[PDB]
Amino acid sequence: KWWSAVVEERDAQSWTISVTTPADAVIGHYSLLLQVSGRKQLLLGQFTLLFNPWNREDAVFLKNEAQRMEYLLNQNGLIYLGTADCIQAESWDFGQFEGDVIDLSLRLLSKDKQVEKWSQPVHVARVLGALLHFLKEQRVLPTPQTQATQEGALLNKRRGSVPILRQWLTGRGRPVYDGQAWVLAAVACTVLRCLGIPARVVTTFASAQGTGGRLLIDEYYNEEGLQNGEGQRGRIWIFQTSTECWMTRPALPQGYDGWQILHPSAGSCDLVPVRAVKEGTLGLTPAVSDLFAAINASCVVWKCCEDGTLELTDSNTKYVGNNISTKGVGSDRCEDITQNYKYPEGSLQEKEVLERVEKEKMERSPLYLLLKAPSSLPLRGDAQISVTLVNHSEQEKAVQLAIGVQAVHYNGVLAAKLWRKKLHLTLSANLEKIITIGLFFSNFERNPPENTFLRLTAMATHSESNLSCFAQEDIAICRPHLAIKMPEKAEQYQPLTASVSLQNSLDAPMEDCVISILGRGLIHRERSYRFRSVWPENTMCAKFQFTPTHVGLQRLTVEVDCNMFQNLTNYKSVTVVAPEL
Amino acid sequence: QMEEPAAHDTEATATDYHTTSHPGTHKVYVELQELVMDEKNQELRWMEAARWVQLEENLGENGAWGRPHLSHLTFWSLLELRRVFTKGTVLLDLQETSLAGVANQLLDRFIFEDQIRPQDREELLRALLLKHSHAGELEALGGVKPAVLTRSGDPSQPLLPQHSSLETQLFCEHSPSGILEKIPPDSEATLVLVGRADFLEQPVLGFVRLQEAAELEAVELPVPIRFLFVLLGPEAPHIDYTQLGRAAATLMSERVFRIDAYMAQSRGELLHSLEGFLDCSLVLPPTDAPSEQALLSLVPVQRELLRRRYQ
Amino acid sequence: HIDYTQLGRAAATLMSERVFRIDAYMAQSRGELLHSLEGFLDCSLVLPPTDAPSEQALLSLVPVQRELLRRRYQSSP
Description:
This is part of a larger assembly, with 1 copy of chain A and 2 copies of chain B.
Chain A: E1 4-10, E2 15-20, E3 29-35, E4 41-48, H1 66-73, E5 76-82, E6 87-93, H2 101-109, H3 121-139, H4 162-170, H5 183-195, E7 199-208, E8 216-221, E9 236-247, E10 258-265, E11 268-273, H6 274-279, H7 289-293, E12 298-303, E13 311-312, E14 314-315, E15 322-327, E16 334-336, H8 348-363, E17 367-372, E18 376-378, E19 382-391, E20 397-408, E21 414-427, E22 433-440, E23 453-462, E24 469-478, E25 482-485, E26 489-491, E27 496-503, E28 514-518, E29 527-530, E30 539-546, E31 552-561, E32 568-577
Parallel strand pairs in A: 8-12, 14-24, 18-24, 26-32
Antiparallel strand pairs in A: 1-2, 3-4, 5-6, 7-9, 7-15, 9-10, 10-11, 12-13, 15-16, 17-19, 19-22, 20-21, 20-23, 23-24, 25-27, 27-30, 28-29, 28-31, 31-32
Helix pairs in contact in A: 3-5
Chain B: E1 6-8, E2 27-37, E3 44-51, E4 57-58, H1 75-86, E5 89-94, H2 99-112, H3 121-128, H4 136-141, E6 145-146, H5 166-171, H6 175-182, E7 187-194, E8 204-214, E9 225-232, H7 241-252, H8 255-263, H9 267-279, E10 282-284, H10 291-296, H11 299-309
Parallel strand pairs in B: 2-7, 5-8, 7-9
Antiparallel strand pairs in B: 2-3, 2-6, 3-4, 8-9
Helix pairs in contact in B: 1-7, 2-3
GO cellular component, one term (chain A): cytoskeleton
Family (chain A): Belongs to the transglutaminase superfamily. Transglutaminase family.
Subcellular location (chain A): Cell membrane; Cytoplasm, Cytoskeleton
């Protein structure tokens, strides 16, 4: 159970030792020395210590074997982006088994000086979370506010995490801008998997960041139906990434072993188990209430006016913090784990738990509408959007309808205004009124930004009274799909062919088509190729040939860069086996 | 109709593939092999021909290594070496453990830069993976004679003077343990392979530095391999692949150059180190002066050149 | 990579050879001058920079230039 050394077999000159290691020791670079009874010390070599989830008495232990492979031995992961309705997978290379990633992680860890807790990975997780959050605050650049679409391909292209770590530690690489600040979770997952703690990145859609302890968010809309001013303290973000670690809590009461969300504080970090979040144990960790409020919060809207006096309005309720998803186990399909955080909606358990929450905190329509909009918009395309209005009164009434479409960042930051329209209607004898309109890519007053989501706001103003109705929707923009053809199986040291095709579904001619391929264990670093013009109706097809070298399950990803858009990514997996003897 | 794209090159994202690790310092043992054919059986194979443990050691037709000696070069050797290194293909920090994978990646990179035509891939790959004999089996073979790769693969005699090399002729006409004692314990191997292919159109050079040293099973060397050179091409005037390999070995014999190769991250650094090496070399014309006095008059200029070398 | 002083020095040393002097004396076109210059470069001896020079090693090359001299006079009366 402690350090020991037993000679397994002895020969004339060769001796075999099977050295035992303690189940909980300080990790780092070690040195082995030998002392003779009389003579001096002689050095043997160096070695490195890591955790392992294969030991049942270790603090880190996972019962399943495949789950160890995905959460510790996998190097090609997926990140889920988009809105809650449409999900996009992006292939990421964590690359935790690179040559010098361990050196970077150890060198960064060496700035703690609490050496006695280096054998306890809870403290290690806390200090690394704090350090990475501070470094992210240090090294993330604000976006260049100037308009240069020609060089957008070199500003938003990602090649994995190893670089990000190299640029954050040494500052000798391509820096990262504020438009992609969700990579912090990926960096944390990479370094944690490097140290031997399994971790995984989850994505929460429509998460209310900002406010601490409140379940109410105020949003103020302009008189026209737009957003007056810019920014807010706490807003509803489009999505949020976070890191989850599998660990046992020895200092905590019984029943909290398992998954823990790592949440840094604006430095200092900490982590909280999932079940504690579900029950609502707010006195268990200072960072419980703020995280809990972000998964179920209410928003109310004030409609600004010319005088400036704000009046509360009746608006349609929106869902906050729903459809939590992550990478599936053993496959490439998304899996939802939102049930681990919340009770089922419209049930008892959520009702009593929430009412306990309110109690704990306090101790311390004649007309309306509903609207149908598509969940996505094809690039350079069009879509029809409908709204229906109903009134409930014996008399007629005049109404004023205002509709606006504007871009927004992924963290609730506005980008630009895109479209506006106003009309007037009259409802009589409580008859339904349906209005379907078309919206085109040519109707925009400017070019929408590269990484933004559209938000549409509809405002119905009642002429006689002051109460008025509001609604909004979130739309994403979908880009043309590209097809990849390649065999599911292949043999080592043999030629392999792949084909890629695309149909130009846009309305503009193609020029400067550049496509690149890459993949770990299949190709070298990356390879790029030119192309000719594609007209708005034709299809382009190409083929590539290579030779796999590393056995097992690999994958390769291609990306297309163009004049209309940048970084159009796709990927495909494959299995390669040893040659037949 | 299915169609292929045009190769494009850019340096937009090379920065992502630069390591922060120290390459480390090692001595290097340089080894040279060439493709020849043995009179016993009509089959091509690679013979070792020279080594650079401390000085250049040459192996004759009988199979006895001569006296280690100075590595003297020729003007043409360095001339075409620079000419082919100027537009060569390099593969840095490759992660492989077999000769087959290295060959496949190098062939793919050659096809990427149009150094070789696609239809020569199979033949070159097959020729690169033949069995690698050693010095001991020469007595089991009884001698070899030079040959050249052919489209059909059938060996033929080259249509060029096949006279023996002058270095062997002038330095030939217990050793493994001796060289193992001479080499430092921390030394890594560098391999150069030379040969001739008739269906090619231009000599091609390939430089490979592995991410870490490995002991390839295909060819036996006492120490793991870190660097590797490939020389191929058709027959041209004023060229000699043996002297090209000798010049490559002598270039590898420099401490500063191998340091630069260890820290190298692009072809430009290797090129710059190559011009730096070329600047500090001197040429001795054919003169009728006494040899010993001419060599003894060399000490001040060579001392100044070496003094200028270390900046 | 041009030093005009060294270019003149190389021209002078090229003029120093007896055989090249005879070639220049009988030359009737540029082709034979090119041939003689290429032959002179063929018998040229280049030595690289080293790390630990010694005269014991430097005396190991002594036969070659003698041979080279014979080769340089291989086509000479």
